Amino acid sequence: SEFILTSDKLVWTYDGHKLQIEPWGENSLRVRATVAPELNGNDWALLPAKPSTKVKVSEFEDSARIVNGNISAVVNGRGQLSFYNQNGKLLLEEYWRTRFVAGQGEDTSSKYFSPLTHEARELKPIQGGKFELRARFESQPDERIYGLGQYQQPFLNVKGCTMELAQRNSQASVPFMMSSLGYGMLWNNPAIGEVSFANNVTTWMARVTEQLDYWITAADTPAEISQQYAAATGAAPMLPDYAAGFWQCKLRYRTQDELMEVAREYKRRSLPISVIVADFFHWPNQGDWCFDTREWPDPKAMIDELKEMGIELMVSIWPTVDNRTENYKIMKEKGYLVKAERGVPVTMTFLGNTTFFDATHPGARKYVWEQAKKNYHDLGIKIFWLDEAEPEYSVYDFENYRYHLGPVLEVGNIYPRGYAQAFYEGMEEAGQTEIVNLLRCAWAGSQRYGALVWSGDINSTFGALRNQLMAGLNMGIAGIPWWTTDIGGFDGGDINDPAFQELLIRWFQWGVFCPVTRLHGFRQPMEEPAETYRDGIAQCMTGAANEIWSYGEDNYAIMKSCLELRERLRPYVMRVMKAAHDTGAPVMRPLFFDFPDQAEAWQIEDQYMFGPDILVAPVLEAGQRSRKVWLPEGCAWIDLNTGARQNGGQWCDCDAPLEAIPVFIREAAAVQAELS
Amino acid sequence: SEFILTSDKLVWTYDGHKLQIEPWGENSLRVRATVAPELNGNDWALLPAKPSTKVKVSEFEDSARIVNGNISAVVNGRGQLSFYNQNGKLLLEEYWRTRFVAGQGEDTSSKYFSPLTHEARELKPIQGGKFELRARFESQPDERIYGLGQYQQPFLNVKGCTMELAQRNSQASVPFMMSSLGYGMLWNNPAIGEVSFANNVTTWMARVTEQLDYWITAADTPAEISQQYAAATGAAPMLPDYAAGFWQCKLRYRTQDELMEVAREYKRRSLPISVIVADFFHWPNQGDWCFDTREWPDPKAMIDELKEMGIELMVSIWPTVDNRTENYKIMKEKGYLVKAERGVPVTMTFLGNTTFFDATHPGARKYVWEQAKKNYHDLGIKIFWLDEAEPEYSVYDFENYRYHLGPVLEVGNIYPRGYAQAFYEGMEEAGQTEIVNLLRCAWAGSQRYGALVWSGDINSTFGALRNQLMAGLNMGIAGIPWWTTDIGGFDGGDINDPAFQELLIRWFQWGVFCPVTRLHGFRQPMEEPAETYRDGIAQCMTGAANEIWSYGEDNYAIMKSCLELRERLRPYVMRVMKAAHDTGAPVMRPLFFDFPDQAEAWQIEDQYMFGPDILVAPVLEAGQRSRKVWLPEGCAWIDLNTGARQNGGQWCDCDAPLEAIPVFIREAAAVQAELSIALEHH
Amino acid sequence: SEFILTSDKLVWTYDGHKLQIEPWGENSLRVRATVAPELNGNDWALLPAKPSTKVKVSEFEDSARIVNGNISAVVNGRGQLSFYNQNGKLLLEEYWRTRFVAGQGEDTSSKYFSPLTHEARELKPIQGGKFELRARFESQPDERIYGLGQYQQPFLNVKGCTMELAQRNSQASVPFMMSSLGYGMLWNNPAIGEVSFANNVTTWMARVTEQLDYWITAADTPAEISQQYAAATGAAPMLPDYAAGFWQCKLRYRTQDELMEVAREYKRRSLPISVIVADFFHWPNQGDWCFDTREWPDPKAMIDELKEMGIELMVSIWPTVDNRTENYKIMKEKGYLVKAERGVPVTMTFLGNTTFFDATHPGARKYVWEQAKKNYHDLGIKIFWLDEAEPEYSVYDFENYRYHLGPVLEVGNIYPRGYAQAFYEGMEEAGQTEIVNLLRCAWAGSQRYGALVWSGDINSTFGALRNQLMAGLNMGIAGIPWWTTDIGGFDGGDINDPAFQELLIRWFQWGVFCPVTRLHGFRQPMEEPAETYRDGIAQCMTGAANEIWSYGEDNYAIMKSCLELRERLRPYVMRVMKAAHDTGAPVMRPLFFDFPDQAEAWQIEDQYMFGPDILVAPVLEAGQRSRKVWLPEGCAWIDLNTGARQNGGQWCDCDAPLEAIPVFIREAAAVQAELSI
Numbered sequence A: 001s002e003f004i005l006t007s008d009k010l011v012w013t014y015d016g017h018k019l020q021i022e023p024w025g026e027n028s029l030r031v032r033a034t035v036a037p038e039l040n041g042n043d044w045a046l047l048p049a050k051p052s053t054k055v056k057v058s059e060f061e062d063s064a065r066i067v068n069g070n071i072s073a074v075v076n077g078r079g080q081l082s083f084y085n086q087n088g089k090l091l092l093e094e095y096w097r098t099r100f101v102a103g104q105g106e107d108t109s110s111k112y113f114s115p116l117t118h119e120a121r122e123l124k125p126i127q128g129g130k131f132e133l134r135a136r137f138e139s140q141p142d143e144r145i146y147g148l149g150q151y152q153q154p155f156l157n158v159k160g161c162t163m164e165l166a167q168r169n170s171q172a173s174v175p176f177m178m179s180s181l182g183y184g185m186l187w188n189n190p191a192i193g194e195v196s197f198a199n200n201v202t203t204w205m206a207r208v209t210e211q212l213d214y215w216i217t218a219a220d221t222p223a224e225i226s227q228q229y230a231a232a233t234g235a236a237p238m239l240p241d242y243a244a245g246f247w248q249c250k251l252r253y254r255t256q257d258e259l260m261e262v263a264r265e266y267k268r269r270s271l272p273i274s275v276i277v278a279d280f281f282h283w284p285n286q287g288d289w290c291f292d293t294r295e296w297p298d299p300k301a302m303i304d305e306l307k308e309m310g311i312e313l314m315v316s317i318w319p320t321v322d323n324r325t326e327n328y329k330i331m332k333e334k335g336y337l338v339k340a341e342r343g344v345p346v347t348m349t350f351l352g353n354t355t356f357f358d359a360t361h362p363g364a365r366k367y368v369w370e371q372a373k374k375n376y377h378d379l380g381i382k383i384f385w386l387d388e389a390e391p392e393y394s395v396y397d398f399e400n401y402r403y404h405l406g407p408v409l410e411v412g413n414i415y416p417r418g419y420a421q422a423f424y425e426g427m428e429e430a431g432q433t434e435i436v437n438l439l440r441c442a443w444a445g446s447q448r449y450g451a452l453v454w455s456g457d458i459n460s461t462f463g464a465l466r467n468q469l470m471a472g473l474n475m476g477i478a479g480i481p482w483w484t485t486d487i488g489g490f491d492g493g494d495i496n497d498p499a500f501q502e503l504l505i506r507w508f509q510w511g512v513f514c515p516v517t518r519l520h521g522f523r524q525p526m527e528e529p530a531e532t533y534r535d536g537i538a539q540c541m542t543g544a545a546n547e548i549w550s551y552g553e554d555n556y557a558i559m560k561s562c563l564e565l566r567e568r569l570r571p572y573v574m575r576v577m578k579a580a581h582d583t584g585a586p587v588m589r590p591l592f593f594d595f596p597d598q599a600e601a602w603q604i605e606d607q608y609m610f611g612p613d614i615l616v617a618p619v620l621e622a623g624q625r626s627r628k629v630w631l632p633e634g635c636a637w638i639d640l641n642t643g644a645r646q647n648g649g650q651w652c653d654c655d656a657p658l659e660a661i662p663v664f665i666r667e668a669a670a671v672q673a674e675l676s
Numbered sequence B: 001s002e003f004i005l006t007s008d009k010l011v012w013t014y015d016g017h018k019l020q021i022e023p024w025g026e027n028s029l030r031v032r033a034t035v036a037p038e039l040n041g042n043d044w045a046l047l048p049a050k051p052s053t054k055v056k057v058s059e060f061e062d063s064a065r066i067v068n069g070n071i072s073a074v075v076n077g078r079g080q081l082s083f084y085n086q087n088g089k090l091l092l093e094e095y096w097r098t099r100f101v102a103g104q105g106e107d108t109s110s111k112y113f114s115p116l117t118h119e120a121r122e123l124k125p126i127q128g129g130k131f132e133l134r135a136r137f138e139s140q141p142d143e144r145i146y147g148l149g150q151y152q153q154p155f156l157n158v159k160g161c162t163m164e165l166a167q168r169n170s171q172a173s174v175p176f177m178m179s180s181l182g183y184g185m186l187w188n189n190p191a192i193g194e195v196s197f198a199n200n201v202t203t204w205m206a207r208v209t210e211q212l213d214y215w216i217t218a219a220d221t222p223a224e225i226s227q228q229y230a231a232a233t234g235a236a237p238m239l240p241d242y243a244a245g246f247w248q249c250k251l252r253y254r255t256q257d258e259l260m261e262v263a264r265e266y267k268r269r270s271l272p273i274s275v276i277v278a279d280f281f282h283w284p285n286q287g288d289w290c291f292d293t294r295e296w297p298d299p300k301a302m303i304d305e306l307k308e309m310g311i312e313l314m315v316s317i318w319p320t321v322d323n324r325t326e327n328y329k330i331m332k333e334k335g336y337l338v339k340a341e342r343g344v345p346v347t348m349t350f351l352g353n354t355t356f357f358d359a360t361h362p363g364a365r366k367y368v369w370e371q372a373k374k375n376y377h378d379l380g381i382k383i384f385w386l387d388e389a390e391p392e393y394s395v396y397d398f399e400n401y402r403y404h405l406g407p408v409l410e411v412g413n414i415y416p417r418g419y420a421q422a423f424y425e426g427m428e429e430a431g432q433t434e435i436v437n438l439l440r441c442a443w444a445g446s447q448r449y450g451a452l453v454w455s456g457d458i459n460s461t462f463g464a465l466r467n468q469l470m471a472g473l474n475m476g477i478a479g480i481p482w483w484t485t486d487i488g489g490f491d492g493g494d495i496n497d498p499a500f501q502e503l504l505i506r507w508f509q510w511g512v513f514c515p516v517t518r519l520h521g522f523r524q525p526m527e528e529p530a531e532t533y534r535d536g537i538a539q540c541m542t543g544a545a546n547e548i549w550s551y552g553e554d555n556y557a558i559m560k561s562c563l564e565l566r567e568r569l570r571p572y573v574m575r576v577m578k579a580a581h582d583t584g585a586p587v588m589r590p591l592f593f594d595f596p597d598q599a600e601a602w603q604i605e606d607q608y609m610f611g612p613d614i615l616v617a618p619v620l621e622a623g624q625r626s627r628k629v630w631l632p633e634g635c636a637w638i639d640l641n642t643g644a645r646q647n648g649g650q651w652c653d654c655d656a657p658l659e660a661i662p663v664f665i666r667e668a669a670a671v672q673a674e675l676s677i678a679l680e681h682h
Numbered sequence C: 001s002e003f004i005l006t007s008d009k010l011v012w013t014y015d016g017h018k019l020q021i022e023p024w025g026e027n028s029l030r031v032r033a034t035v036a037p038e039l040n041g042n043d044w045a046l047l048p049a050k051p052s053t054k055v056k057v058s059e060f061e062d063s064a065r066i067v068n069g070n071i072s073a074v075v076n077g078r079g080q081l082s083f084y085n086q087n088g089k090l091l092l093e094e095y096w097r098t099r100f101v102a103g104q105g106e107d108t109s110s111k112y113f114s115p116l117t118h119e120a121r122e123l124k125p126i127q128g129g130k131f132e133l134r135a136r137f138e139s140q141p142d143e144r145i146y147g148l149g150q151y152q153q154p155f156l157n158v159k160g161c162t163m164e165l166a167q168r169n170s171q172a173s174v175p176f177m178m179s180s181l182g183y184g185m186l187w188n189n190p191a192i193g194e195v196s197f198a199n200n201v202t203t204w205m206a207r208v209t210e211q212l213d214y215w216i217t218a219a220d221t222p223a224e225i226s227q228q229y230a231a232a233t234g235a236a237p238m239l240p241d242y243a244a245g246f247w248q249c250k251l252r253y254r255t256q257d258e259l260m261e262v263a264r265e266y267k268r269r270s271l272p273i274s275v276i277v278a279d280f281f282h283w284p285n286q287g288d289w290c291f292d293t294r295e296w297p298d299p300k301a302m303i304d305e306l307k308e309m310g311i312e313l314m315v316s317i318w319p320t321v322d323n324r325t326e327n328y329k330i331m332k333e334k335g336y337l338v339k340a341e342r343g344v345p346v347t348m349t350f351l352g353n354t355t356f357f358d359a360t361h362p363g364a365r366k367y368v369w370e371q372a373k374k375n376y377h378d379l380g381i382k383i384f385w386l387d388e389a390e391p392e393y394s395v396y397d398f399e400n401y402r403y404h405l406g407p408v409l410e411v412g413n414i415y416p417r418g419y420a421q422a423f424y425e426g427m428e429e430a431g432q433t434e435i436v437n438l439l440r441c442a443w444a445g446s447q448r449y450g451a452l453v454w455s456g457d458i459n460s461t462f463g464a465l466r467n468q469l470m471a472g473l474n475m476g477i478a479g480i481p482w483w484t485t486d487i488g489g490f491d492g493g494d495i496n497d498p499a500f501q502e503l504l505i506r507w508f509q510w511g512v513f514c515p516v517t518r519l520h521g522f523r524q525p526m527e528e529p530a531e532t533y534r535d536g537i538a539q540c541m542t543g544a545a546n547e548i549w550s551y552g553e554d555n556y557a558i559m560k561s562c563l564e565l566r567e568r569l570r571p572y573v574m575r576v577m578k579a580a581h582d583t584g585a586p587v588m589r590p591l592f593f594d595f596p597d598q599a600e601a602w603q604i605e606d607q608y609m610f611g612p613d614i615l616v617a618p619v620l621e622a623g624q625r626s627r628k629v630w631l632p633e634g635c636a637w638i639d640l641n642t643g644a645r646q647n648g649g650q651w652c653d654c655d656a657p658l659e660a661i662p663v664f665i666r667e668a669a670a671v672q673a674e675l676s677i
């Protein structure tokens, strides 16, 4: 057992195991461990640290200690690590269960003494290869845990839950967590694996990796934790103005004329509309990244008319490359495609045999961007819908695929970050500022590449709506402030079904108080293409209409008023977006973000704060016409729908007619005057 | 160390390793070993053995011995095994290199003493799984080794060569070997692996297996070894008479009219023709197994007219099932398809995303047969072209596929046998006798299912032709008497190119003296289909013409006379085919099969015997117009082309003009009279 | 398909596959290939290249070419590679069997066209990991192949043979090959694997690796190839004088008194003796690396007396560290030990549970050297016996062990080079020149660390003797000029058995004309130790006596004249050793090394050249009293035993009584003058 101590770095070593702890921004430490000869150069999501002035490394008895502001790490003579805040309170301690460790007998008076033989930092060698990593920490009975990204589950507090560290359609692993004990932690490792916050032990796992790497931060409030995390992995940029308006989309406007007729109908009725969207398979083949002129005769003319109307066009980008295309040939020559380890060299079979471009290859990123630049960006398109961002393998056999940066088991989760980066860096180099692209997935730090994330191809049910509320809140905690959904859900909504129409209204009303308000879906009754194939290429179907006038007049009036409300909200949304850029605060936040001293704020999972001044209580059940709403203590609250004043620190039974959900405004906040 | 002996079985055991040796037919032993609790019930290619009456099991000193006729196995107290014949000559010896084995020190006076620590029977456990098997035997300085199946290499004798135990297009692993030391050995294990007959050590390897299993046989002559092997794995059936005639094929007759135009034109020129062939993609989609009526409007009328003409139709069967078909849906419901272990559930991407039917699944065999029965056999088609029989994965990642009988790594090589079995059993059940189907691949015992094997999609060169001669002869030694090639090779022959025309003629001349005489290929210039797609299904191209009149008048005359010569040979062919059925002897044989006592017979690799009465000496180089020919001792030889008589036991410098290759007939054999060999005085 | 060409580098790429060919010494090229983003920085055995005189890179048609003196590489538009010499003759061509390659249909007129789908450079991805590599080349009909290291097999020409690329007791993978077609090739990759020189195809295989890496060289003669190889991987140093004399050893002299009594007896009988050896388990425990004072009370006094007698002491070093020792604790603290991937953390169980020191770890190398320096070298010991150099795992499950530089499957074969390096660098740093240590194993480049390799614990038979001849010759071709055996073999020789005694004499006679003349073995009847354990530590047995007088008076007379003959040869041996250092030529050479233009020189495997002036024809069978000997053309030959002159270019029946083997001297060679004076 040997310490190697300098003024700003703690290293411990035994039997080739190196544990290295150092400052990494104010109130924060980076922890690394390896049994290779040295640590490698992989920083993954962590940006260069602003130097800490206050770091102090000490030695006492058989231990060593490193303090950086409000966090300290203690490593004992057996190489066992625990973390404390500035008040000396335990934040986090490693989980050891051994009789012998670091060449020494374990202390029989400690819960660490056990014949079971579990190490806190298990680097298990893979034969012929690298390491299978498990990092174990003690559970705590009072610990509540948030963040981790976007999971399709009805839990805000994820203590007791196990989350797969993998990317699938409707899931995003963004592995930053925030604990109610007063710390946050980033698992700075893109390997396929799992995080289990089980009641008996916390275990982080990486299937294949070179080394342990995490970042831990301490502060007295969630807001400071979020700020410290944003300094570690990058700030969201400033949201462009147009992104705060209404985004109109469906699966799918099949022709230029169809899309333009919708936009013209919005303008004919003087309705708000900021963005309109051309969904997938508007292209001749996958990997062409251009409009098919048979259905889109004059894209420039579409964009120019939309510009006259004050509307931005967003276009679908698929990362797939069909093997019959010219771009497949050239990308294959250059080595810019993902590779199958075994079997046919095909990663997806949706409407063609396609291979994904490799978003971890800097050359492939540039290539795909420059195709999109030439065919779309040069025409005046400045928003891209970066769909299939996981990427969506037809079969999620992660072991069977390899990227430029290594096997998908080792590096796979960073794909969506690279995909967003390709477009953000490309658009920035082309002279665009305030970039936003619609990404289906993300990793740690995706926020710095302007990633507006949505929750994918979920079903159209109230159960799904409930999951989306939890997922969006946890995404904000994981540092992804720009987040949204398909209003009404993606799959299964019949436009003539009264039950779906009720869900649509409830989801729309919530969508007004989401970071982006976006109508999209694949509505029934669907329509098969007239021709199944054209030039041997399978043709893509469409769903039914999905405009605010498509569901009758009663529903039209409700959604029209929703759009008018969203327009009145825009200055407040831009203020909250600037705050997200400035301070790393989410836009939609759990109650504890703004009221961390109040017990109820850490319990309630069906209410949230839309910025600091608006309390939102969505209706999450069919047929519900009232619900209980807890009003936080410390201010009075103004009912958005009645103008009535209510004192903080009480439960209210609130009216929730089909035409409105309960929403309260912080008294005397600037947004109060803006909304009436 | 412990022997468990009975009157007809030797078992040795130490530390869970069981070695079991027992008689398995006359002059033959089966050898099995495992570290599992017991031996499993897998017999693979071995048929039940006829009881051997005089089997003798003894123990002496610390050793044990089992004798069965001309072969004996000796196992010493360290479990080390060697084989001897009735004259006490060493046939085959296990390779051990250890200082400590079976709980005992190794003998320092033996070549077995070595710190290296190699076992002869290495069952290396796969973590969480079964075993990786290596069976090591000592090499022997003057051992020459034949058989093993069909490999694309210019070596008849494969001592010093390493052969992959896997099935790929143009390769067939049929793992029966015959040694010049006077034994034969079947590796009775369908696992993916390798056999290396290296000069320093012989190693058989199986990637995944439950147990070691081989069959070994001893006799004084090759013919006896071949007979004993056919008794162990099954006799070839009797060939139907039409199969000895001329088979006309190309890639591809696209329509009923095109095929019938060729058939009628053969009859109009009074040319011999016994089989005509409809190649692949005559169907609406892969897995439909029926004629596409747009190109083939009345299959019944086609078959009836061909029958009036004395011609059998053969049709292409592909084992692929495209995922848009009705049979895919049903076969998926029932579990009748091969499965990918990882990635997209697609085993081949040629003209569609297809999955192979599982030829190791009894239910799937029956399902595919009954489709072919309903759509082809009930109409009067008696011959099936079982193509892609390996099967031809787009990528040969054997580790990524699984069959009914287990992972491809453990059982993969038996697929072509099951594919043959599916059609043979079905046609037999339907009342057909004398069955022959054209298979691209085979395993040990494929011969019993009427498998006429051909050597696949080789290129059209003299290099290829040389490889095919070696491959065809080794297939015969491996117990596959019915074997042929694409005359001219498959890929790359332009019909207007003199260099290819030269090759076509030499290959055709050789083809006359192959077990089946079959013209096929994908000739240039190729023609793309008019429509690349139809109903979203990719359409299949065709090559150029490939009939005997398609290469100019001078070449037409040579091929015409080749066909006429083949017809005169038919009675002899049918006698030699009967001998293959009765004795297990190959049809095309190396010289050592008929003349085992003569040294030149074990050295010469560019001559062979076509039955016992015809010596063939093919021309295997462009521009060559004469070659040396060794005539075997013990008889006189009649030159087929001149009529001259030559004494056995000499090298002759033979004329070999474009119009004929050197062929010699055994004097006074019945075939001499049948060939009508004159000698005019001008 | 894309070429990236500069003045001295050819790169070809398709689908992330990068093939890079460049000069690496005169008449030589280095070939690397990877599917990773870039080539790594691993040079393994290749030393920095001297920049070449006339390197030319050019593109023509759809191909590219790189010429460096007498070798050239051609890469076509399908990425397929072949090598030619200055006369345009094909040396080596890649084996491809595909219908489609590098995005293009294959040529149907070529032997490369095949549906089998075998690539010449197969970098097969291991799931979650690196690559399984197969490099395939066409076999050639008259190609004869030599080198590869030390294998226990009766084949000099290894065409048709398959060799394991792994290190085991009695085997050494030193993967430089020399072909009769006029090239040599180093497989510059330490991975566990295999080389298959099959008649139908040549296949090199690595179980786990990051990239393809080989070095290829061309010259008109074997001598130039050997020289070019030595420039690439390092010259053998100059051998010290004492190493050419007689090395006396057995398993084992158990005490200081017992060793010294043998040394004194050799001097008392006026017999030559240059080195005497303390074998294993002279230490308190494995990993102590010091004399046990209970059996060795005054080591400094022993060394001083041997110095007075003109004798160097060599001591056994074992790379094992027993888990009860002080050094185990410290080396485990520092991470200087080899690791088991699974199961009990024990690599060997011989007389204790031990773990090997990690010879690929620079710190571990330094640690072990400094233990040996403090306890042996500082006392005046100048030669170490680096035994168990593979290292000798109790079970050779290479997948189950890991070194500093990675899994044993990826890097394992370089261990013995590291082991030699540890002592050579330390001894050189300590002020010693002309270093020689006795290594049981080697890899490519081991020669530069003064590695005298011996063929390990082989059995005592005539079969073994035949194998050793072949192995030693092939080790020389592989660039290991300092090579020897246990005279008599290691295991199974009973000193009272007349059959063994005959083998011993024939082996000794051959031993006179080996690069080093060294007597060693574990002779029967063996003797168990007095007590099985002392202080819980299992005690090591000894074999019977193994001195030249231990086998009766008639045998003593023969071995006595062998030693005297060896002393007369020492000036010649030292000249041949200097030539090895200057030119990379081996000491014991096959006939084709000195007579490459003669057909018989490439066929004969039971004769060899001991330097350029002595033709040796050992007796390799029991009871043989005469044998056939081919005399090379171009000079006359003097029979060493009779003095009779013989013209070159003929076969002779030579008398081979028990008292001599047929040896011939090149007429008028300086060694003829030295032997007759």
Ligand SMILES: O[C@@H]1[C@@H](O)[C@@H](O)OC[C@H]1O
Pocket (backbone or CB within 6 Å): A250, A251, A279, A280, A387, A388, A440, A456, A457, A490, A521, A522
């Ligand atoms: O939202 C959908 C997206 O997730 C994918 O399936 O492509 C079509 C879109 O409508």
